[PDB]
Amino acid sequence: XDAXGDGDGXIP
Amino acid sequence: XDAXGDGDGXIP
Amino acid sequence: XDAXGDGDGXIP
Amino acid sequence: XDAXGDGDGXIP
Numbered sequence A, B, C, D: 001x002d003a004x005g006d007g008d009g010x011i012p
C-alpha cells in the first residue's frame, strides 16, 4: 503493498 | 493511478 | 492451477 | 515469478 497512509487504494 | 487491471487497490 | 484472475501465467 | 522450468504459465 500500500501507499499514502490511507491503506489499500486511494492515494497510491 | 491504478495497477493490476482490477482498478483501485487490490493488486498494485 | 492459476492465480491473479487473469488465467494462466501473467500475474501468479 | 515462474515455476516448472517451462516459463510463465504451463506447469506452476
Ligand SMILES: CCC/C(C)=C/COP(=O)(O)O
Pocket (backbone or CB within 6 Å): A001, A002, A003, A004, A007, A008, A009, A010, A011, A012, B008, B009, B010, B012
Ligand atoms: C507498486 C509500488 C507502490 C505501491 C505498493 C502502490 C500501491 O498503493 P495503494 O494503491 O495505496 O494500495
Ligand SMILES: CCC/C(C)=C/COP(=O)(O)O
Pocket (backbone or CB within 6 Å): C008, C009, C010, C012, D001, D002, D003, D004, D007, D008, D009, D010, D011, D012
Ligand atoms: C506464486 C508462487 C509460485 C509461482 C511464482 C507460480 C507461478 O508459476 P507460473 O504459472 O509457471 O508462472
Ligand SMILES: [Ca+2]
Pocket (backbone or CB within 6 Å): A001, A002, A003, A007, A008, A009, B009, B010, B011, B012
Ligand atoms: Ca495495496
Ligand SMILES: [Ca+2]
Pocket (backbone or CB within 6 Å): A002, A003, A004, A005, A006, A007, A008, A009, A010, A011, A012
Ligand atoms: Ca493508499
Ligand SMILES: [Ca+2]
Pocket (backbone or CB within 6 Å): A009, A010, A011, A012, B001, B002, B003, B007, B008, B009
Ligand atoms: Ca489507485
Ligand SMILES: [Ca+2]
Pocket (backbone or CB within 6 Å): B002, B003, B004, B005, B006, B007, B008, B009, B010, B011, B012
Ligand atoms: Ca489494482
Ligand SMILES: [Ca+2]
Pocket (backbone or CB within 6 Å): C001, C002, C003, C007, C008, C009, D009, D010, D011, D012
Ligand atoms: Ca497456471
Ligand SMILES: [Ca+2]
Pocket (backbone or CB within 6 Å): C002, C003, C004, C005, C006, C007, C008, C009, C010, C011, C012
Ligand atoms: Ca495468472
Ligand SMILES: [Ca+2]
Pocket (backbone or CB within 6 Å): C009, C010, C011, C012, D001, D002, D003, D007, D008, D009
Ligand atoms: Ca509467471
Ligand SMILES: [Ca+2]
Pocket (backbone or CB within 6 Å): D002, D003, D004, D005, D006, D007, D008, D009, D010, D011, D012
Ligand atoms: Ca511454468
Ligand SMILES: [Cl-]
Pocket (backbone or CB within 6 Å): B002, B003, B004, B005, B006, B007, B008
Ligand atoms: Cl484497472
Ligand SMILES: [Cl-]
Pocket (backbone or CB within 6 Å): C002, C003, C004, C005, C006, C007, C008
Ligand atoms: Cl483466472
